[PDB]
């Protein structure tokens, strides 16, 4: 229930691996953000110097937050579409971290992946509808913004508009066409809430990767797990701890720590390390190499 019991034998990656291969760990939820795709060539938002927030000066914005805000987008969509052209990759190649989540699916351990990313790499790695909540939407599809129309357009169509530097307009009504992403100020998809309600009743392990846990309501998902569910963060930096003034936050280090583990480094490296403990290293290496070779062959 709301009882804090310690289920990990030690607060380390090795403890987590032993837990995962015990009978008690049947249902894993992954919570992921932009840090899992930086090694695929899509910058994150908040890393100093390389993050998007430090690379927006040329967009002539009234302030740097505006390019990801819906009110600004509706008044002036051109900066967002100019940024999209700058960031759009010529190749969509998921990372080792993405393929680790594919292994969790194939091994029958993945209850759900909640992602904040819009880059479609989870789908390319093989996560399907049953497996995936795109909490901040996706570029995979786009829609006309007019309420009476809402025509859908595929990514091939949206890509061509972005690269032509033509602001995308609906062929049926000539309204703006917007990628199916959730800007600041927009509602998250309904399936975010339906999945959260159900999934967090029965999760045995929470695996948090590549996110600063600064955007809501996504960040609050860590607090929805039962109090005895272990939580592993694989990230370059600690994240998710309660602020000492504003304060179910992460507790890696206090005298009361009992279930949260931080593995600090590259998401690809941490996933590889965890796979090795699990006996999955060869499977992961073979999977990534074959999928990458097939993508390179396209």
């Amino acid at each position: 229930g709301s009882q804090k019991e310690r289920l990990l034998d030690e607060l380390t990656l090795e403890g987590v691996a032993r837990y995962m291969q015990s009978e008690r760990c049947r249902r894993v939820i992954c919570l992921v953000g932009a840090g899992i795709s930086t090694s695929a060539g899509i910058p994150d938002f908040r890393s100093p110097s390389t993050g998007l927030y430090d690379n927006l000066e040329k967009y002539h914005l009234p302030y740097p937050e505006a390019i990801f805000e819906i009110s600004y987008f509706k008044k002036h969509p051109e900066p967002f579409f100019a940024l999209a052209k700058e960031l759009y990759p010529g190749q969509f190649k998921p990372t080792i971290c993405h393929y680790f989540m594919r292994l969790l699916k194939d091994k029958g351990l993945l209850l759900r992946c909640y992602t904040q990313n819009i880059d479609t790499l989870e789908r390319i790695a093989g996560l399907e509808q049953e497996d995936l909540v795109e909490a901040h939407g996706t570029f995979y599809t786009s829609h006309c913004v007019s309420a009476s129309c809402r025509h859908e357009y595929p990514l091939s169509w949206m890509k061509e508009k972005i690269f032509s530097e033509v602001t995308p307009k609906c062929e049926d009504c000539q309204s703006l066409v917007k990628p199916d992403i959730v800007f600041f100020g927009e509602s998250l998809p309904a399936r975010f809430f339906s999945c959260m309600q159900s999934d967090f009743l029965k999760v045995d392990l929470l695996l948090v990767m590549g996110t600063s846990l600064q955007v809501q309501p996504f960040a609050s998902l860590i607090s929805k797990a039962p109090l005895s569910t272990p939580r592993l963060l694989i990230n370059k930096e600690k994240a998710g701890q309660s602020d000492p003034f504003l304060g179910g936050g992460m507790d890696f280090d206090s005298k009361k720590a009992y279930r949260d583990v931080a593995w600090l480094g590259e998401c690809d490296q941490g996933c590889l390390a965890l796979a090795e403990l699990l006996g999955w290293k060869k499977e992961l290496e073979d999977l990534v190499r074959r999928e990458h070779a097939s993508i390179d062959a396209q």
Binding site: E65, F184, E186, S187, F193, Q214, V215, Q216, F218
Partner: peptide, 5 residues
């Protein structure tokens, strides 16, 4: 609910 910082 809405996406917020």
């Amino acid at each position: 609910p809405k996406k917020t910082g």
